[PDB]
Amino acid sequence: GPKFPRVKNWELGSITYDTLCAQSQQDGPCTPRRCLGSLVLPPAEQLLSQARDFINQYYSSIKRSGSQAHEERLQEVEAEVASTGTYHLRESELVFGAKQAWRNAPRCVGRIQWGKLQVFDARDCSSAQEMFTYICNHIKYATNRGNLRSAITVFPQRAPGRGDFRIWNSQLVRYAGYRQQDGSVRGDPANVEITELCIQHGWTPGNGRFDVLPLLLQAPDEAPELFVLPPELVLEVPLEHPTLEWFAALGLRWYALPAVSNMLLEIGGLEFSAAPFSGWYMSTEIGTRNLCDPHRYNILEDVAVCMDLDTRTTSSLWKDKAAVEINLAVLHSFQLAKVTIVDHHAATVSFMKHLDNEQKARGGCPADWAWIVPPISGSLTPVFHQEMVNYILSPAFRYQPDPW
Amino acid sequence: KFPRVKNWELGSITYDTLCAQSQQDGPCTPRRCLGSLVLPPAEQLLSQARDFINQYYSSIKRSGSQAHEERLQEVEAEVASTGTYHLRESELVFGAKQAWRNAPRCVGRIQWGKLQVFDARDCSSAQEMFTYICNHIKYATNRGNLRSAITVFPQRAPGRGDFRIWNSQLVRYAGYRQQDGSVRGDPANVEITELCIQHGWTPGNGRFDVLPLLLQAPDEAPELFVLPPELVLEVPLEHPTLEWFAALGLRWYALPAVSNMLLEIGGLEFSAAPFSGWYMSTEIGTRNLCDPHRYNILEDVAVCMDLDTRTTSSLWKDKAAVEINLAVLHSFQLAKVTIVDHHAATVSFMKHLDNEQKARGGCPADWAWIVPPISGSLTPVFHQEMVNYILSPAFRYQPDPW
Numbered sequence: 158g159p160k161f162p163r164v165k166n167w168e169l170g171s172i173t174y175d176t177l178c179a180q181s182q183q184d185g186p187c188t189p190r191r192c193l194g195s196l197v198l199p200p201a202e203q204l205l206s207q208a209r210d211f212i213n214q215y216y217s218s219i220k221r222s223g224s225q226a227h228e229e230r231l232q233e234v235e236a237e238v239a240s241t242g243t244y245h246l247r248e249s250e251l252v253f254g255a256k257q258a259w260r261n262a263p264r265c266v267g268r269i270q271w272g273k274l275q276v277f278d279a280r281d282c283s284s285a286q287e288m289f290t291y292i293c294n295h296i297k298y299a300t301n302r303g304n305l306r307s308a309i310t311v312f313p314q315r316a317p318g319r320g321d322f323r324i325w326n327s328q329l330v331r332y333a334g335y336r337q338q339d340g341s342v343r344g345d346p347a348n349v350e351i352t353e354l355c356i357q358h359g360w361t362p363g364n365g366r367f368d369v370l371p372l373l374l375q376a377p378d379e380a381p382e383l384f385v386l387p388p389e390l391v392l393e394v395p396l397e398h399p400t401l402e403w404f405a406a407l408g409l410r411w412y413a414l415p416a417v418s419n420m421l422l423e424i425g426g427l428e429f430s431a432a433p434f435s436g437w438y439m440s441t442e443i444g445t446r447n448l449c450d451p452h453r454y455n456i457l458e459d460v461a462v463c464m465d466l467d468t469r470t471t472s473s474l475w476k477d478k479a480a481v482e483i484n485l486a487v488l489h490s491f492q493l494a495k496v497t498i499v500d501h502h503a504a505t506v507s508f509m510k511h512l513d514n515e516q517k518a519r520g521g522c523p524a525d526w527a528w529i530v531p532p533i534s535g536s537l538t539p540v541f542h543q544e545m546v547n548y549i550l551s552p553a554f555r556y557q558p559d560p561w
Numbered sequence: 562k563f564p565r566v567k568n569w570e571l572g573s574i575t576y577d578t579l580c581a582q583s584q585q586d587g588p589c590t591p592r593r594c595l596g597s598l599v600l601p602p603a604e605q606l607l608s609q610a611r612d613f614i615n616q617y618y619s620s621i622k623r624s625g626s627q628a629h630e631e632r633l634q635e636v637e638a639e640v641a642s643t644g645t646y647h648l649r650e651s652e653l654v655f656g657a658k659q660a661w662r663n664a665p666r667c668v669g670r671i672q673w674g675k676l677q678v679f680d681a682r683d684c685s686s687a688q689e690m691f692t693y694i695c696n697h698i699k700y701a702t703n704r705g706n707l708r709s710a711i712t713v714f715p716q717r718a719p720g721r722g723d724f725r726i727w728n729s730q731l732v733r734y735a736g737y738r739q740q741d742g743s744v745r746g747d748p749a750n751v752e753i754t755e756l757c758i759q760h761g762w763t764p765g766n767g768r769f770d771v772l773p774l775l776l777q778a779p780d781e782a783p784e785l786f787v788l789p790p791e792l793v794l795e796v797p798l799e800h801p802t803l804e805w806f807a808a809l810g811l812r813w814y815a816l817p818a819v820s821n822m823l824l825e826i827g828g829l830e831f832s833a834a835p836f837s838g839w840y841m842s843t844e845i846g847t848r849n850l851c852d853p854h855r856y857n858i859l860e861d862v863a864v865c866m867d868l869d870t871r872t873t874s875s876l877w878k879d880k881a882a883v884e885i886n887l888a889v890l891h892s893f894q895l896a897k898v899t900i901v902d903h904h905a906a907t908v909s910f911m912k913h914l915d916n917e918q919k920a921r922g923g924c925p926a927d928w929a930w931i932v933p934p935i936s937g938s939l940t941p942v943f944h945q946e947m948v949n950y951i952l953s954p955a956f957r958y959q960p961d962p963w
C-alpha cells in the first residue's frame with residue numbers, strides 16, 4: 158500500500174489514505190513510545206518561511222501558483238519583513254486565512270460550513286471602546302434574529318514591543334458563576350474566575366443562575382475596560398420539553414450565539430490575539446455538557462427526580478434517560494424559538510460528508526476523534542465508526558495564555 | 562518530560578512515569594496521531610525473557626535471590642542451546658494476569674488479580690483443545706455466576722504451525738449472507754459461518770444459531786466441534802415495563818470469551834489462549850444490537866415505541882438505544898447472570914486508575930475504547946485524560962489463520 162496513514166471506516170468497510178498530513182509543519186504531543194491524543198492541552202527568518210508558505214497557499218487557492226503576481230507578492234512580503242520585522246495581509250488574504258483556520262480545526266464537527274464565513278476586518282481598531290462597537294455589530298450580524306450566520310471579527314495583529322488586543326472573556330456570552338459561602342456555586346462554575354475579575358474591575362454582580370456577564374476588553378498597553386451588553390442584543394432561549402409539562406417550571410435557558418473569544422488566529426506567522434468567531438450550537442453542547450457536566454450546571458439529578466426515576470442505582474439508567482430528555486428539550490425549545498441549532502445526528506452526518514469532500518479536495522482531513530464524537534449516543538453516530546488522523550496545519554486557531 | 566495527566570471534572574493532576582517502561586512503539590509520531598486506528602534473533606528473545614523473569618521475582622518480593630539467579634541461568638542456558646525456552650506454571654499464571662493488567666482497551670481491569678488460569682500446554686490435538694474449551698466454559702459460566710478465566714494452549718514454535726481457534730469468540734451467532742444482499746443473524750460472523758459450512762457444518766436458518774468451533778492443531782486442517790447446548794448459557798431479552806419487547810425474540814449469550822488474540826509473555830507467544838470474563842451491558846445493548854453493521858434493531862424498537870422516525874431531532878435513536886440497554890440489564894439481572902452497567906464499570910475503572918497510580922506510577926488506557934458508546938460524558942472516564950502505550954506481557958492481534 159501507500160506510505161501514508163491508512164484510515165478505515167468500520168461501519169462501511171471503506172479505506173482511504175491521508176496524504177494531507179504530509180503538509181503538517183508543526184509537531185503534536187505524540188511519540189512512538191506513547192499516545193497523548195486524549196490530552197486537552199498537550200522570530201526573524203522563522204516568520205518569513207511561515208509567510209512564504211501561507212502566500213503559496215493563497216496563490217494555490219486562486220490558481221496563480223508560480224505566476225508573476227505570486228512572485229511579486231513574495232518579494233513584497235520579504236521586503237516588508239526586511240525593513241519592519243513584520244508584514245501585513247491583503248484583505249483577501251485575511252479572508253482566505255480565516256476560512257482556512259476553521260477548515261483546519263481538528264476538533265470542529267461543523268466544518269461542512271467552512272466556506273461560508275463572514276469575515277469582518279477590524280484591523281483598524283484603536284481603542285477598547287471601538288472593540289466594543291465592533292463586537293456589538295458582530296453579535297447583531299451573527300444573531301440575525303435567530304437565523305444565525307457564521308462570522309469572525311479580526312482585530313489588529315500582535316506587534317513588536319506593543320501590547321496585545323485581548324478579549325478577557327472566553328466567550329462573548331457567559332453566565333456569571335458566584336462562589337457561595339457554603340463553597341458551592343450559583344450560576345456557571347466554568348465562569349467563576351472571569352466573574353470575580355469582572356467584579357474586581359468594578360462590575361456590580363447580580364445573584365441569579367443566568368446573569369449575562371459584561372465584557373472585559375483590552376486595547377494595547379491599557380488595563381481592560383468593562384462593557385455591558387445591551388440585553389436586547391443577547392438572544393436567549395427559555396427551555397421547555399415537548400411532552401413533560403413541568404420542565405418549563407425549572408426556569409432553565411441558554412443563549413443563542415456561541416462566540417468564542419479567547420483563541421489566537423495564526424496566519425502566515427501573523428498572530429491575531431483578538432479574533433472572536435461564532436457559528437451556531439450543536440445541541441449536545443448545551444443539553445449534555447453545559448447542563449449535565451458535574452462541574453457545570455449539574456442538573457441531571459434534579460431532572461431525574463422530576464421524572465420519578467430510581468436515582469439510587471446505576472442500573473436504572475436514570476442518568477441516560479434524563480440526559481436524553483434534556484437534549485430533547487434543548488432541540489425542541491430552539492426549534493420553537495426559530496433559533497438555528499443542530500442535533501448531534503445531523504451534525505455528524507454532515508461531518509461525514511465533509512470528510513469525503515476533503516478527501517477529494519486535499520487528500521485528508523485533520524480530526525480529533527475524542528472531540529468529534531458527541532458526548533451522548535457516540536456509537537449511534539456515524540463518526541464513532543470512522544478512524545481519524547490528527548495533525549496541525551496552519552492557518553490555525555490556537556489556545557493562548559490568559560492575559561492576567 | 563513524562564506526561565502530565567489531568568482530570569477535568571475534579572481538577573486533579575498525575576504524572577505517568579510507567580510509560581518509560583514501554584519497549585514497543587505505538588502508531589503515533591510527532592507529525593500525526595493515529596490513536597483512533599483499531600488495528601496496528603536470540604538476544605532479542607533473551608532480553609524480553611530476563612526482563613519478564615525479573616518482573617516475576619520482583620512480584621513475589623524475591624528479587625536477587627538464589628531462586629531468581631538460577632532461574633535466569635535456566636532461561637539463558639535453554640535459549641542459548643535451543644533458541645527458545647518454557648515458562649514455569651506459576652510464571653505463566655503471573656504473566657497472564659499481567660497481560661490483562663496491561664491491556665489499554667480494557668475497562669474491567671479492577672478485576673485483574675482475579676483470574677483462573679488453566680494450563681493447557683500439554684495439548685496435542687484439536688480433540689484435546691475441545692475438552693479444554695468445554696471445561697473452561699463450564700467453569701467460567703458457573704450457572705450464571707461468571708468467573709474470569711484463561712486457558713493457555715501450547716506456545717508457537719519456530720519449525721511448525723500454530724495451535725489456533727479459528728472463531729473470534731467461543732460463542733458466536735451465525736450470519737447467513739442472503740442472495741439478495743442482506744444478512745440473517747450476526748453480520749460480524751458471515752465469514753466464520755461460511756468457513757464452518759465449508760468444513761462440513763449443517764447450517765440452521767435463524768438469527769441466533771450458535772456456531773460450532775473450528776479448532777486447529779499445528780499444520781493440520783481445522784476440525785469442527787459443536788458445543789453442547791447445555792454449556793452455552795443464554796439470556797432471553799425482555800423489558801421491565803415494555804411488554805411488546807420480549808416479542809422481539811431477542812437474546813444474547815452470557816459468556817464473552819475471546820479466542821483470536823495472541824498472548825505474549827517473556828517473548829513467548831501463545832497463539833491460542835482464549836479468555837473470558839463478563840459483559841458490560843453496552844457491548845450487547847448498544848454495539849452488538851444497535852451498530853448499523855450488526856443486528857441494527859434501532860428502527861424496529863423505535864417503531865414499536867411509536868417514535869417519530871422521520872427526523873433526527875426527535876432523538877428517536879437515543880431513546881430506543883436507552884431502552885435496549887435497560888432491557889439487557891434487566892434481563893441479565895432477572896436471569897441471575899453477571900453483568901455490569903457502564904456507570905458502575907467506569908466508576909470502578911477510576912478506582913483502578915488510582916490503585917495503579919500508587920502501585921506502578923501510571924496506567925496505559927485507550928480513551929476511545931474506555932469511554933462507553935452511549936452517554937459518554939455522563940461517565941467519569943470522559944473527563945479523565947489517559948496515556949496509551951504498550952507494556953509487556955500483552956494481548957495482541959494476529960493474522961486470521963485462513
Ligand code: HEM
Pocket residue numbers: 255259262264265266267268270274307308309434435436437438439442499504528554
Ligand atoms: C457553523 C456551525 C458550527 C458548529 C455546529 C460547530 C461545532 C463545534 C463543536 C461542537 C465544537 C466543540 C466545542 C466544545 O466541545 O466545547 C467545535 C470546535 C471548534 N470549532 Fe466549530 N462549529 C461551527 C462553526 C465554527 C466556526 C464558524 C469556527 C471558526 C471560524 C469554528 C471553529 C471551531 C474551533 C477552533 C473549535 C475548537 C475549539 C477548541 O479546540 O477548544 N467552528 N465546533
Ligand code: HEM
Pocket residue numbers: 657661664666667668669670672676709710711836837838839840841844901906930956
Ligand atoms: C471481568 C470482567 C471484564 C469486563 C467487564 C471487561 C470489559 C471490557 C470491555 C467492555 C472491553 C472492550 C470490548 C469491545 O468493545 O469489544 C474490554 C477489552 C479488553 N479486555 Fe476486558 N473486561 C473484563 C475482563 C477481562 C479479562 C479476564 C481479560 C483477559 C484476561 C480482558 C482483556 C481485555 C482485552 C485484551 C481487551 C482489548 C481487546 C481488543 O483490543 O480488541 N478483560 N474489556
Ligand SMILES: N=C(Nc1cccc(COC[C@@H]2C[C@H](OCc3cccc(NC(=N)c4cccs4)c3)CN2)c1)c1cccs1
Pocket residue numbers: 198267327415416417419434435436437438439442556557558559
Ligand atoms: N458551537 C460552537 N461551540 C464551540 C466551539 C469552539 C469552542 C467552544 C467552547 O470552548 C471549549 C472549551 C474552552 C476551553 O479553552 C479556553 C481556555 C481556558 C483557559 C485557558 C486557556 N488557555 C490555555 N490553555 C493556555 C495557557 C498557556 C498557554 S495556552 C484556554 C477548552 N474547551 C464552543 C461554536 C463557537 C463558535 C463557532 S461554533
Ligand SMILES: N=C(Nc1cccc(COC[C@@H]2C[C@H](OCc3cccc(NC(=N)c4cccs4)c3)CN2)c1)c1cccs1
Pocket residue numbers: 599600669817818819836837838839840841844958959960961
Ligand atoms: N466483556 C468482554 N468483552 C470483550 C473484551 C475484549 C474483546 C471483545 C470483542 O473483540 C473486539 C473486536 C475484535 C476486533 O479485533 C480483532 C481483529 C479485527 C480485524 C483484523 C484483525 N487482525 C488483523 N487484521 C491483522 C493482520 C496482521 C496482524 S493483525 C483483528 C475488533 N473488535 C469483547 C470480555 C471478553 C473476555 C473477557 S471480558
Ligand SMILES: C[C@H](O)[C@H](O)[C@H]1CNc2nc(N)[nH]c(=O)c2N1
Pocket residue numbers: 195196197527528529569943944945946947
Ligand atoms: C479527557 C478528554 O480529552 C476531555 O474530557 C474531552 C473529551 N472530548 C471532548 N469533546 C468535545 N467536543 N469537547 C470537550 O470539551 C471534550 N472533552
Ligand SMILES: C[C@H](O)[C@H](O)[C@H]1CNc2nc(N)[nH]c(=O)c2N1
Pocket residue numbers: 167541542543544545596597598599929930931
Ligand atoms: C474508529 C474507532 O476507533 C472505533 O469505532 C472504536 C471506537 N471505540 C471503541 N470502543 C470499544 N470499547 N470497542 C470498539 O470496538 C470501539 N471502536
Ligand SMILES: [Zn+2]
Pocket residue numbers: 187191192193194589593594595596
Ligand atoms: Zn496519538
